[PDB]
Design an enzyme around this catalytic site. Structure first.
Site, PDB file in Angstrom:
ATOM      1  N   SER A  30       0.735  -1.241   0.011  1.00  0.00           N
ATOM      2  CA  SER A  30      -0.060   0.067  -0.158  1.00  0.00           C
ATOM      3  C   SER A  30       0.707   1.545   0.220  1.00  0.00           C
ATOM      4  O   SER A  30       0.327   2.190  -0.314  1.00  0.00           O
ATOM      5  CB  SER A  30      -0.919  -0.161   1.095  1.00  0.00           C
ATOM      6  OG  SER A  30      -1.917  -0.851   1.039  1.00  0.00           O
ATOM      7  N   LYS A  90       0.888   3.692  -2.868  1.00  0.00           N
ATOM      8  CA  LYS A  90      -0.190   4.506  -3.151  1.00  0.00           C
ATOM      9  C   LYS A  90       0.221   6.026  -3.305  1.00  0.00           C
ATOM     10  O   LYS A  90      -0.269   7.050  -3.714  1.00  0.00           O
ATOM     11  CB  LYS A  90      -1.361   4.504  -2.265  1.00  0.00           C
ATOM     12  CG  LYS A  90      -2.288   3.135  -2.385  1.00  0.00           C
ATOM     13  CD  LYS A  90      -2.952   3.160  -1.170  1.00  0.00           C
ATOM     14  CE  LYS A  90      -3.999   1.760  -1.475  1.00  0.00           C
ATOM     15  NZ  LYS A  90      -3.364   0.602  -1.452  1.00  0.00           N
ATOM     16  N   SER A 125      -6.132   3.036   2.870  1.00  0.00           N
ATOM     17  CA  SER A 125      -5.386   2.239   2.055  1.00  0.00           C
ATOM     18  C   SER A 125      -6.423   1.484   0.926  1.00  0.00           C
ATOM     19  O   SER A 125      -6.379   0.120   0.903  1.00  0.00           O
ATOM     20  CB  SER A 125      -4.691   1.233   2.821  1.00  0.00           C
ATOM     21  OG  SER A 125      -3.608   1.859   3.587  1.00  0.00           O
ATOM     22  N   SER A 151       0.971   3.524   5.704  1.00  0.00           N
ATOM     23  CA  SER A 151       1.279   2.185   6.243  1.00  0.00           C
ATOM     24  C   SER A 151       1.098   1.199   5.019  1.00  0.00           C
ATOM     25  O   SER A 151       0.416   1.435   3.938  1.00  0.00           O
ATOM     26  CB  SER A 151      -0.054   1.626   7.149  1.00  0.00           C
ATOM     27  OG  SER A 151      -1.308   1.807   6.552  1.00  0.00           O
ATOM     28  N   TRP A 204       0.919  -3.435   4.265  1.00  0.00           N
ATOM     29  CA  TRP A 204       0.884  -4.665   4.615  1.00  0.00           C
ATOM     30  C   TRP A 204       0.766  -5.489   3.391  1.00  0.00           C
ATOM     31  O   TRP A 204      -0.346  -5.680   2.894  1.00  0.00           O
ATOM     32  CB  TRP A 204      -0.184  -5.047   5.687  1.00  0.00           C
ATOM     33  CG  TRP A 204      -0.083  -6.641   6.304  1.00  0.00           C
ATOM     34  CD1 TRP A 204       0.809  -7.563   5.710  1.00  0.00           C
ATOM     35  CD2 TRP A 204      -0.697  -7.033   7.327  1.00  0.00           C
ATOM     36  NE1 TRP A 204       0.785  -8.468   6.441  1.00  0.00           N
ATOM     37  CE2 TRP A 204      -0.166  -8.306   7.571  1.00  0.00           C
ATOM     38  CE3 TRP A 204      -1.473  -6.422   8.319  1.00  0.00           C
ATOM     39  CZ2 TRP A 204      -0.743  -9.000   8.617  1.00  0.00           C
ATOM     40  CZ3 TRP A 204      -1.848  -7.123   9.368  1.00  0.00           C
ATOM     41  CH2 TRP A 204      -1.516  -8.601   9.518  1.00  0.00           C
ATOM     42  N   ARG A 261       2.785  -1.837  13.677  1.00  0.00           N
ATOM     43  CA  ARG A 261       3.602  -0.929  12.920  1.00  0.00           C
ATOM     44  C   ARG A 261       3.618   0.539  13.408  1.00  0.00           C
ATOM     45  O   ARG A 261       4.840   1.090  13.507  1.00  0.00           O
ATOM     46  CB  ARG A 261       3.450  -1.165  11.322  1.00  0.00           C
ATOM     47  CG  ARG A 261       3.463  -2.317  10.773  1.00  0.00           C
ATOM     48  CD  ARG A 261       2.698  -2.573   9.568  1.00  0.00           C
ATOM     49  NE  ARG A 261       1.356  -2.649   9.771  1.00  0.00           N
ATOM     50  CZ  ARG A 261       0.043  -2.482   8.875  1.00  0.00           C
ATOM     51  NH1 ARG A 261       0.674  -1.943   7.842  1.00  0.00           N
ATOM     52  NH2 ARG A 261      -0.952  -2.503   9.365  1.00  0.00           N
TER      53      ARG A 261
HETATM   54  C1  LIG Z   1      -1.685  -2.023   1.795  1.00  0.00           C
HETATM   55  O1  LIG Z   1      -0.412  -2.547   2.334  1.00  0.00           O
HETATM   56  C2  LIG Z   1      -2.863  -2.942   2.058  1.00  0.00           C
HETATM   57  C3  LIG Z   1      -3.724  -2.097   3.167  1.00  0.00           C
HETATM   58  N1  LIG Z   1      -2.603  -1.815   4.324  1.00  0.00           N
HETATM   59  C4  LIG Z   1      -3.344  -1.879   5.488  1.00  0.00           C
HETATM   60  C5  LIG Z   1      -2.911  -1.370   6.578  1.00  0.00           C
HETATM   61  O2  LIG Z   1      -1.556  -0.737   6.459  1.00  0.00           O
HETATM   62  O3  LIG Z   1      -3.414  -1.280   7.728  1.00  0.00           O
HETATM   63  C6  LIG Z   1      -4.877  -2.167   5.358  1.00  0.00           C
HETATM   64  S1  LIG Z   1      -5.947  -0.992   5.492  1.00  0.00           S
HETATM   65  C7  LIG Z   1      -7.349  -1.997   6.909  1.00  0.00           C
HETATM   66  C8  LIG Z   1      -8.580  -1.432   6.410  1.00  0.00           C
HETATM   67  N2  LIG Z   1      -8.610  -0.150   6.818  1.00  0.00           N
HETATM   68  C9  LIG Z   1      -8.002  -0.122   8.074  1.00  0.00           C
HETATM   69  C10 LIG Z   1      -7.158   1.266   8.331  1.00  0.00           C
HETATM   70  O4  LIG Z   1      -6.365   1.347   7.672  1.00  0.00           O
HETATM   71  N3  LIG Z   1      -7.818   2.127   9.182  1.00  0.00           N
HETATM   72  C11 LIG Z   1      -9.033   1.891   9.823  1.00  0.00           C
HETATM   73  C12 LIG Z   1      -6.955   3.459   9.363  1.00  0.00           C
HETATM   74  C13 LIG Z   1      -6.989  -1.215   8.064  1.00  0.00           C
HETATM   75  C14 LIG Z   1      -4.815  -3.219   4.031  1.00  0.00           C
HETATM   76  C15 LIG Z   1      -4.162  -4.496   4.062  1.00  0.00           C
HETATM   77  C16 LIG Z   1      -3.645  -3.216   0.732  1.00  0.00           C
HETATM   78  C17 LIG Z   1      -2.839  -3.576   0.077  1.00  0.00           C
HETATM   79  O5  LIG Z   1      -4.642  -4.230   1.250  1.00  0.00           O
END
Ligand SMILES: *C(=O)[C@@H]([C@@H]1N=C(C(=O)O)[C@@H](S[C@@H]2CN[C@H](C(=O)N(C)C)C2)[C@@H]1C)[C@@H](C)O
Length: 237
Positions: A40, A43, A87, A178, A180, A220
């Protein structure tokens, strides 16, 4: 700082950059020269390329289409900035499709992003390869963004900077993204960004660590803010 890191089973590195000095902390420092999928965190570059090439604006609303997405939190409308902090992958896949594979490939090579490879699929390359990038490359990318020194229009860099604005702490400002990557083995965790300190100095950082499915989503960012407090970069309010 070091007692904090091996209080977990954490295979981790935390990198900082002030514009002259790369500093390494954590339990696995070689992670900083190792390349991982951006997940992510891509982005940031997706928004920059999209805004520079007139494929989207920072006020446009990407409306939900009704089809359930990977997370229920993604089943709504988003601006690029709102999708940045959520994300929201489907919004940024729609953007990457507007950009197209040839322009996306040419632009990532132009700005020297990671290994500059995207392959054939314009909405998958940052999620399962071949695009990879090291944490040092990541700190230097967001540091350049902070200074307006990336190969993009200044107002484009300013717009994406605002999309990353996550906390104000007195006269200090945190900007962060962030990541993941779950569709790779092993899974990779990212927390990258920069602090615009009250004294005027910017410090960019990148957490990069191994993940597994049981891990808490907030780990993280907690780790990163904990370290930044220890470093004096971003003291807790
Ligand atoms: C990207 O790396 C992936 C996304 N990264 C995520 C993360 O860093 O948390 C999640 S988003 C997940 C649902 N929205 C929540 C959030 O960030 N808040 C509520 C602030 C957590 C996702 C795995 C993507 C490639 O899938």
């Amino acid at each position: 700082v070091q007692a904090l890191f091996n209080e977990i089973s954490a295979d981790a590195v935390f990198v900082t950059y002030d514009g002259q000095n790369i500093k390494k902390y954590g339990t696995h420092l070689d992670r900083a020269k190792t390349a991982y999928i951006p997940a992510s965190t891509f982005k940031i570059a997706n928004a920059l390329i999209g805004l520079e090439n007139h494929k989207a604006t920072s006020t446009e609303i990407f409306k939900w289409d009704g089809k359930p997405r990977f997370f229920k939190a993604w089943d709504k409308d988003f601006t690029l900035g709102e999708a940045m902090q959520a994300s929201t992958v489907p919004v940024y896949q729609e953007l990457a499709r507007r950009i197209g594979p040839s322009l996306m490939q040419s632009e990532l090579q132009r700005i020297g992003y990671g290994n500059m490879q995207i392959g054939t699929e314009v909405d998958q390359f940052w999620l399962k390869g071949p695009l990879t990038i090291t944490p040092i490359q990541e700190v230097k990318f967001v540091y350049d963004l902070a200074q307006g020194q990336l190969p993009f229009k200044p107002e484009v860099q300013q717009q994406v900077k605002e999309m990353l604005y996550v906390e104000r702490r007195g006269e200090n400002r945190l900007y962060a993204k962030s990541g993941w990557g779950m569709a790779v083995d092993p899974q990779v965790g990212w927390y990258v960004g920069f602090v615009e300190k009250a004294d005027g100095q910017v410090v960019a950082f990148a957490l990069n660590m191994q993940m597994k499915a049981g891990d808490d989503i907030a780990l993280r960012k907690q780790l990163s803010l904990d370290v930044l407090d220890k470093l004096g970069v971003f003291h807790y309010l």
